[PDB]
């Protein structure tokens, strides 16, 4: 909005940190079932806890 | 709809009864638990009868049962008074005492005095300390039995 509270800004920050894709060294771990992050949120489609 | 002959019968399954069905898959597990707990209690009350205290003889009520005789709840005060056992003490030697029992007829009374007398004969009161004062029995009747009595103590047989 460009007029944020601090509460909201911090919320957004964490959401922004969560988006990154898996580190590829994770795929090489021993008992690995994970191939892709599957919790990736694109701003244009799917619109936050808000 | 009824079809040709049968008891015009009323079942009581109109409330939500399946919400309150009470199964019995416990029961074996229960039966054991009681039994362990029973054997533990014996072992705790070491030479004392497993039974409990001694209990009076007593006739049932009503015309129906009338003829039979059970164990009652506890010996009346008159019965203790006549036997000559102080009521407060009688509890301490394993004699059941209720005090709410009347005593109408003298046939039921003298029988129940006789019971207590007999009990007091065949009772083995241990002394408080290993050093032996009055009342406490001989070390003969002590070594020869610190034995529990299995089953109800002096059982009533109609």
């Amino acid at each position: 909005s460009s007029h944020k509270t601090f509460r909201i800004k911090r919320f957004l920050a964490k959401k922004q940190k969560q988006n990154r894709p898996i580190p590829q060294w994770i795929r090489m771990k021993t008992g690995n079932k994970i191939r892709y992050n599957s919790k990736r949120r694109h701003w244009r489609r799917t619109k936050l806890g808000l | 709809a009824p079809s040709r002959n049968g008891m015009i019968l009323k079942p009581h399954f109109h409330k939500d009864w399946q919400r309150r069905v009470a199964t019995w898959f416990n029961q074996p597990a229960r039966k054991i638990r009681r039994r362990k707990a029973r054997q533990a209690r014996a072992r705790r009350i070491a030479p004392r009868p497993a039974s409990g205290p001694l209990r009076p003889i007593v006739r049932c009520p009503t015309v129906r049962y009338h003829t039979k005789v059970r164990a009652g709840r506890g010996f009346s005060l008159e019965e203790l008074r006549v036997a000559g056992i102080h009521k407060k003490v009688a509890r301490t030697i394993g004699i059941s005492v209720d005090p709410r029992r009347r005593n109408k007829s003298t046939e039921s009374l003298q029988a129940n005095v006789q019971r207590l007398k007999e009990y007091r004969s065949k009772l083995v009161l241990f002394p408080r300390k290993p050093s032996a004062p009055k009342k406490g029995d001989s070390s003969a009747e002590e070594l020869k039995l610190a034995t529990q009595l299995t089953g109800p103590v002096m059982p009533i047989r109609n």
Partner: protein, 122 residues
């Protein structure tokens, strides 16, 4: 290289602080070095220094709190920290002496009419 709990226990209070400071300094430089590449060889230390820092701080708090409960062991009113936490309800049980207070009437009863060890059939 290794900072152990072992040795720190005996050390003087001012000496423990200098050591913490000197680790806090060493942590800073590695954090600086993590930004500017640095080297894997440096970026190990950062974990090590962190835990040695904790090892120091821990020893200090253990020493401060041991001394503290020496100081109150005897006094009736003592800080909530130093009072023994068991479980809310368990800190409202009866006192351990208060729940074995017999009434004189009950004591007299136990004196006059004690349960006796007895057996039957002899």
């Amino acid at each position: 290289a290794k900072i152990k709990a072992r040795d720190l226990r005996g050390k003087k209070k001012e000496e423990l602080l200098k050591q913490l400071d000197d680790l806090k300094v060493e942590l800073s430089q590695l954090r600086v070095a993590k930004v500017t590449g640095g080297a894997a060889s440096k970026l190990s230390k950062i974990r090590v220094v962190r835990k040695s820092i904790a090892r120091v701080l821990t020893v200090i708090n253990q020493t401060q709190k041991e001394n503290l409960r020496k100081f109150y062991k005897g006094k009736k009113y003592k800080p909530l920290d130093l009072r023994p936490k068991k479980t809310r309800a368990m800190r409202r049980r009866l006192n351990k002496h208060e729940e074995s207070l017999k009434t004189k009437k009950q004591q007299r009863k136990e004196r006059l009419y004690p349960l006796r060890k007895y057996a039957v059939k002899a």
